[model samples]
Target: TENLYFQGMSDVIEGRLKELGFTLPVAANYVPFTISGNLLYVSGQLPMESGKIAVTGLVGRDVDVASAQRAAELCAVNILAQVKAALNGDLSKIRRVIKLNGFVASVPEFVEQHLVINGASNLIATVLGEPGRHARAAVGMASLPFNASVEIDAIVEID
Candidate 1:
């Protein structure tokens, strides 16, 4: 049963990307998912391409909600890239996106943290299909480690 599920995951990812017209990169780590028994941990991903942060702007300050949400989605895309690489193209092995941790850079008064993180939450669920429905938390911080406006990290526990 475990092996079959893993097999189905690869096919699901391949087929979905084809239908969605999306192409995932072979990441430097080549680890999109790591499974220890039934626990799968996807890494903390930056919105980077060939070592470049794709989007940069502070939420509720330099950028508005829409743009920050886009940045959050872009960050989710990068996480998927890493996930695909780890799963070696197998998505079925992923039981579900167990939790999503979102970090938003904002001024002290920024209060729409949950809405901004919804960008990543919605996109990840859309991409992973059934496995994206899971719990999540959105946190607002004065600054991120790399001056990134938004960052998303996830944990998936698969069968």
Candidate 2:
């Protein structure tokens, strides 16, 4: 079963990232991840690939829920990439996913933000098991940076 491979295994997580063709974004003025004590805060991640926003537009207008979900998953992958970089390529240092803050760009009437963010939520769980389960907020926004469909940030506890 997939569970056999998904049980708190960093190799599986790393493997999945590779399969998805993930490469950590270049560091900018704002570092991707920060550590204070044993807690790590990852900055908001957009669905970016090769220096481009992979998904752009407002949900329920230019973009659909399904596509937004995929964007969220991509954001999650980047989040993990940031985490790995912060840990010097060591994902095993992560103790738990504490929280996720998701921002969904949408028209006022678009109310499926929660469902869209679930794409990241589910993937984190599938990769990290118990530690991946965490508190979260999925909010709708008038617009997002670069007009990307979704952006995600996270708080984590680490060893």
lDDT of 2: 0.86
TM-score of each: 0.79, 0.87
- Superposed model 1: Cα runs more than 4 Å off: 1-22, 28-34
In model 2, where do residues sit more than 4 Å from their true spots? 1-8, 16-28
For candidate 1, the TM-score is: 0.79
Please name the candidate that would achieve the greatest TM-score relative to the true structure.
2
lDDT of 1 at 157: 76
lDDT of 2 by residue, 74-96 (tens): 89988988888887766767789
Give the alpha carbon lDDT tens digit for every residue of 67-108 in model 1.
787778777777777766656566665677889889898887
